[PDB]
Amino acid sequence: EKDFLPLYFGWFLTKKSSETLRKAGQVFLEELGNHKAFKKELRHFISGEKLELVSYFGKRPPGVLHCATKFCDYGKAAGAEEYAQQEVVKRSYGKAFKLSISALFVTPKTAGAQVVLTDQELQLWPSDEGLPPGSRAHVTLGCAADVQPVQTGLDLLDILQQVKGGSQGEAVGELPRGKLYSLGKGRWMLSLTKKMEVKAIFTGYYG
Ligand SMILES: [Cl-]
Ligand SMILES: [Cl-]
């Protein structure tokens, strides 16, 4: 009888760190919704007055927030066994880490936070494109009704791809904690003046 792996590995934020990022995320969806530049380009955000984004991203993580590394599906996913067998993964299991979050973003599908992993933390990132490894690292804050949390990372990569070309353009707003950027196609990004640090434990979720 074999030992099945978790649903996925990842950094799970503490109560206080989750509380902080959660409320910060809420404050962002409230300011963005009330903002002038957003109300203008609302046609490219919804096919259908004001839109309250906190309600729009109705599906939100219930307990503590997290930053996933490798989706394993208890060993069914490709490379799950290989990832879990790594010394660095087994060594890091249950240990605390400090994740740096550089920006919060919003798309028609998801709302999340961009994670900038350290070189130490990148060793825990699966190497199973076009952007540097770990660019997909994120914390999902919310999803639209028929969107799956896996979308959040994909949305982030799409936004970072627009940053490669430099389609970010000039900041279309100054929020209390950073500069607002309009990427188009209902995509928005808040570059934080100060990268907020969150405390999290690297472990495995079984669900
Ligand atoms: Cl903040
Ligand atoms: Cl969808």
Author numbering: 161 to 208, 213 to 292, 300 to 378
Quote from the publication.
2′,3′-cyclic nucleotide 3′-phosphodiesterase (CNPase) comprises 4% of total myelin protein in the central nervous system (CNS), being the most abundant CNS non-compact myelin protein4. CNPase consists of an N-terminal polynucleotide kinase-like domain10, a catalytic phosphodiesterase domain11, and a membrane-anchored C-terminal tail, which contains a cysteine residue that undergoes isoprenylation. The CNPase catalytic site, lying in a groove between two lobes, has pseudo two-fold symmetry and contains two apposing His-X-Thr-X (X denotes a hydrophobic residue) motifs, characteristic for 2H phosphoesterases 113537.
In addition to the catalytic His mutants, near-complete catalytic inactivation is evident also in T232A, T311A, F235A, F235L, and Y168A. The inactivation by the T232A and T311A mutations was expected: threonine or serine is found in the catalytic motif in all 2H phosphoesterases, and in CNPcat, they are involved in all stages of catalysis, in achieving the correct substrate binding mode together with His230, His309, and the active-site water network.
